[PDB]
């Protein structure tokens, strides 16, 4: 569980930073998504 | 007369009209299936290992590799250009439709 701590803390600090650098494209998603 | 002589033969009208899957289907009723509410939550002091081995790690992992940014805004911005040429076909349409509508009118006028 400690393990996961350790992996949710390190993978999620990753996928926080992954997702708002990515941002869900959100001005391509707005882009992509006013489109439809 | 757009406000008496339809009111009127309405009026007419009418008088002559006083003269004369199984899965599927049940969810429609409004609720829909409960999904695994399981994953997310957890405890470290409750009940179950597999949850936190069998639920948390591989999965995280799995996200971890499939959460990506290789290829990032180039492959989102390369089906924007697929969805403008999907756009500008309808529209094509539009007008194929509006033409020969509007011709059809104009022999009828004559």
Redesign the interface.
């Known amino acids: 569980?400690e393990?996961?701590l350790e992996?949710?803390q390190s993978?999620?600090e990753?996928?926080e930073q992954?997702?708002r650098?990515?941002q869900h494209?959100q001005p391509?998603e707005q882009?992509?998504n006013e489109?439809? | 007369i757009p406000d008496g002589y339809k009111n009127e033969i309405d009026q007419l009208v009418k008088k002559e009209f006083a003269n004369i899957t199984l899965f599927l289907e049940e969810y429609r009723r409004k609720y829909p299936r409960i999904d695994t509410s399981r994953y997310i939550p957890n405890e470290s002091s409750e009940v179950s290992l597999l949850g936190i081995v069998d639920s948390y790690l591989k999965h995280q992992e799995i996200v971890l590799d499939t959460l990506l940014p290789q290829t990032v805004s180039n492959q989102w911005r390369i089906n924007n250009d697929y969805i403008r040429q999907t756009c500008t076909i309808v529209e094509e349409m539009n007008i194929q439709q509006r033409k020969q509508i509007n011709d059809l009118e104009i022999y009828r006028k004559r």
Do not use: E
Request: charged residues 10%; hydrophobic residues 55%.
């Open positions: 569980t393990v996961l992996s949710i993978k999620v990753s996928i992954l997702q650098k990515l494209v391509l882009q992509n489109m439809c």
